[PDB]
Amino acid sequence: DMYIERAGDITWEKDAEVTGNSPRLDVALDESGDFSLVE
Amino acid sequence: GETTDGVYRVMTRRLLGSTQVGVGVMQEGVFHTMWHVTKGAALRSGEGRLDPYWGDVKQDLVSYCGPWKLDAAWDGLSEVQLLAVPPGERAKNIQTLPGIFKTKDGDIGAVALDYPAGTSGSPILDKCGRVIGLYGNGVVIKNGSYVSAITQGKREV
Numbered sequence: 533d534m535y536i537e538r539a540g541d542i543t544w545e546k547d548a549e550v551t552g553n554s555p556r557l558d559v560a561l562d563e564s565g566d567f568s569l570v571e
Numbered sequence: 572g573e574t575t576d577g578v579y580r581v582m583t584r585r586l587l588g589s590t591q592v593g594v595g596v597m598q599e600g601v602f603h604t605m606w607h608v609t610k611g612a613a614l615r616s617g618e619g620r621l622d623p624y625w626g627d628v629k630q631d632l633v634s635y636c637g638p639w640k641l642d643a644a645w646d647g648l649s650e651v652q653l654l655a656v657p658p659g660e661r662a663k664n665i666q667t668l669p670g671i672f673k674t675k676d677g678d679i680g681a682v683a684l685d686y687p688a689g690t691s692g693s694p695i696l697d698k699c700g701r702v703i704g705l706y707g708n709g710v711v712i713k714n715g716s717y718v719s720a721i722t723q724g725k726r727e728v
């Protein structure tokens with residue numbers, strides 16, 4: 533059996549750690565809900 | 572049991588110890604998570620039981636106790652925050668500028684942040700704190716890293 537536990541409020545944090553890039557990717561989505569890269 | 576709005580961990584006592592299989596959002600008495608986290612199975616919140624209400628394997632979404640409530644959308648310009656809830660670690664906001672997944676059916680925002688798979692279901696937020704989607708479904712790029720889509724459901728009526 534799976535169970536849930538509260539981990540916090542859903543709030544925006546000012547001055548949070550800013551990381552990660554913004555890649556534009558050509559993707560395909562199949563019937564199983566799985567993405568794949570199109571090339 | 573606990574139905575207060577907020578972010579929750581999805582745990583299981585089936586494997587060794589207590590293992591985190593994912594994360595979810597409680598909003599308006601509805602628990603929202605990714606389909607691959609629970610596989611549509613029932614959830615427990617203390618003594619209470621949460622039964623699935625709506626689900627779809629292709630969208631990779633599932634709701635509990637009621638219809639999908641989250642309808643906020645990424646504006647296509649602004650930075651967003653992944654409120655990442657990693658296994659055994661505290662909830663942490665990570666700001667990033669999302670990229671784009673270009674598909675045959677339209678474009679979808681995408682966050683390029685890598686986390687343990689048990690982080691799937693963590694909400695992505697806009698500057699107002701509104702949930703614009705869930706993190707956990709995307710693609711593996713050349714360097715072995717992950718780029719998740721900003722997966723949002725549809726609110727009915």
Ligand SMILES: N#Cc1ccc(C(=O)Nc2ccc3c(c2)CNC3)cc1Cl
Binds near residue numbers: 565566684686687717
């Ligand atoms: N960082 C990272 C990272 C790496 C992998 C995954 C993951 O495997 N997700 C997933 C699993 C099964 C299914 C789907 C997605 C949709 N269809 C079934 C999640 C994350 Cl967050």
